[model samples]
Target: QLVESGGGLVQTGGSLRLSCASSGSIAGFETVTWSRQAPGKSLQWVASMTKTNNEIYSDSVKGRFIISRDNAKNTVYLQMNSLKPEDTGVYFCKGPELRGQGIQVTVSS
Candidate 1:
């Protein structure tokens, strides 16, 4: 339940990687959706990832966002590349019955 555990601070044009982890069985938590909220926006859909290796994304982030999962670790990973200041936001991951802790990512010079 830790995303951006230390608070993400990625410089502009850099890559930002996040991992959403939890306890319990992967079978019950094999699927997840990532959402984000900009400074003024709330709960915007980002993408969904399945342990089976299928990923679906929002058009807003279809260009550079990637999602994947590792059943062994019970973790889902999010990677965004060539980030800009506009990518700054709070990101969340959710599953069949649980909510993520939400991580704040900041993009700066």
Candidate 2:
């Protein structure tokens, strides 16, 4: 997968995005999650949804982590900034428990 790697190695001060498709209609796009998955492991919650227009961070998710919506595409995204080498991993786009699992986005640039 040289054209693109299955996993990515993100550097400090970089930005990344993970998008998940919503499974329902109106009134169900408010929650989402950004997770980190190691090569052979389950997803670990890295951050949770922030109501539109509001910004908050998890205990260790500050410095440039952001979650936003793209209603036009029915997708939610997580953007990380000033990343660390440890940030290298698979990121999945997920939503509220009710919304179900999300699509996997392979990060590479």
Candidate 3:
């Protein structure tokens, strides 16, 4: 398992946080990746971060997503605002060869 993501319930129009931890230090790494899957849909890419302080995003999540990291804790974080049903899914922080757990997030009105 590279990493895992988990979050509980959040109300629509609110905010939610998800995390990913690595077995080892991930300091000084450029760019962090994230992906997700719906209950019965295919896997999809969630906007990603680049070390150059750049973020790549899909229109679906554009303008409402942010990413950050903590090397000492060997953890990376994802912050998404304006929760919606479409945002409810299994999410994971990913690296080129790193894999982790998937967190179930639910956004209800």
Candidate 4:
């Protein structure tokens, strides 16, 4: 799994975007799962996508967060707008053959 994110300081109300690219064969892979983990905490499911590219967000992230996939690029993306300081955390994405380790994202005032 290849992962990328704009880490470091991000001002509150700014938008945050993260991407996860598939490296190898992804045939039959129908779903992409996204998660977040705050410092020293358990993982929280953020969103998921179906084979048809139907996106679903968890209750906690439904309003200001979005999840999307680009089949042509074999990539999945996560975006959150109007970020709050509490948004600081590590984000992760998982697929059939891939498991993103997670990327740090810091939010500041």
Candidate 5:
């Protein structure tokens, strides 16, 4: 399994998007999940796509975050619009055999 995102800084109120991919060896998209961590905080589950291709967001991220996948590439995408300063954090991808340390997203005024 593998994960990646274009790490960088962004201005507040901009759009943020990240992508992660997994190998076919994994059980499929049902088990794929996304998480995040603050500078020194514990993990936070953002959202995930179900086997039926439906997206469900966590309570903390319900409005601004969207999670989707591309079956052809076995990849997952995270998009968040109207970014805020508190959105700065390290996002992660949880795959079948490995947990990937994803790109760092920094949002500022």
Candidate 6:
């Protein structure tokens, strides 16, 4: 199984792209959640993406994040915009209920 999760960390207010690649069936799967866990903070469900590539973000994270995937590459991308200092944290990508390769993203302001 080829899985790529978190690797490098980037600063906030800048563009960052983190991808997730798994070795399981991904064709019919919908709703991949990009989440964040920070120091002294609760797990934040950042955003979700459908099989058709439409994205939905958490109410608390509105207008700040976007998610997309490329079936051919079995990769998922999470893009953040106008990140605030509050967005500083670590992130992960996961399937709805399936065990997946754990990844992390770090954003600093």
Could you report the Cα RMSD, in angstroms, for every candidate shown?
Answer: 2.3, 6.1, 2.6, 2.0, 2.1, 2.9
What tens-digit string does per-residue lDDT give for candidate 6 at 22-73? 5566542355777777789998878888766778888877776677877652
Q: Decide which is better by lDDT, 1 or 3.
A: 1
Q: Kindly report which residue pairs in candidate 2 clash with one another.
A: 13-82
lDDT tens digits by residue: candidate 4, 1-106:
4646655668998887787776566532358888889978888888998877888888767789888877663787888887888778888888777777787888
TM-score of every prediction relative to native: 0.83, 0.59, 0.81, 0.86, 0.83, 0.71
Worst 10 residues of 2 by lDDT: 1-10
Q: For model 1, state the Cα shift of residue 41 in Å.
A: 1.2
- The digit string of per-residue lDDT tens for model 1 on 1-109 reads 4333424888988887787777665543477888888876777998997656689998877889898777564677888988888878898878777677788999997
Best TM-score among the predictions, by candidate number: 4
TM-score of 2: 0.59
Model with the higher TM-score, candidate 3 or 4: 4
The candidate scoring highest on lDDT is 4
Clashes of each: 0, 1, 7, 0, 0, 3
Per-residue lDDT, model 4, residue 100, is 75
Measure candidate 3: CA RMSD.
2.6
Instruction: Give Cα distance to truth, residue 4, candidate 5, Å.
Output: 0.5
lDDT of each: 0.77, 0.56, 0.75, 0.78, 0.76, 0.66
Q: Name every residue pair that clashes in candidate 1.
A: none
Candidate 2 lDDT by residue in tens digits, 14-98: 6665555554455344665567766677767777765564545666677667877665435666777766665656665544443
- Give the poorly placed runs of model 1, Cα more than 4 Å off: 1-7, 26-28, 50-52
